[PDB]
């Protein structure tokens, strides 16, 4: 396989290994690879499998709920968290002895 790929096959040629293994650039991706509908990692389709196995399938109900929510709320106000000083709710740091 190495000789088919073009690696050095002689001791005197071992000194130009980098020119045949690392220097050569990798072919850029085909532009069709940027148009895929979905890029989620592949997983075995657990149709016909037990419910216990299906529990490990990607949760499509969450996607449906998120789609519904974003359809219902195309535009929302920017949340602002009050910076006013407030007494801590967890007072252990200032009220612990040991």
């Amino acid at each position: 396989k190495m000789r088919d790929l073009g690696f050095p096959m002689e001791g005197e040629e071992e000194e130009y290994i980098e020119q045949r293994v690392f220097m050569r650039e990798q072919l850029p991706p085909l532009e069709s690879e940027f148009w895929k509908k979905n890029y989620d990692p592949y997983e075995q389709d657990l149709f016909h499998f037990p419910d216990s196995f299906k529990a490990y399938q990607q949760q499509y109900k969450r996607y449906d709920e998120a789609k519904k929510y974003f359809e219902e709320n195309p535009n929302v106000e920017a949340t602002i968290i009050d910076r006013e000083f407030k007494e801590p709710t967890n007072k252990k740091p200032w009220t612990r002895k040991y």
Partner: protein, 53 residues
Amino acid sequence: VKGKGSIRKGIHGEGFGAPSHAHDALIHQIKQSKDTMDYQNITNEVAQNFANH
């Protein structure tokens, strides 16, 4: 397929293993999305590796 042993070519592509063997999701991901990971997905293999460690 020439030079690939029992691996045989289908209509839409050539398989990555012998006919009756099981497809590997990790190999599929490496081939399709080589070098790209949007997030560190925790598969069963990753979870089991964490548990073993």
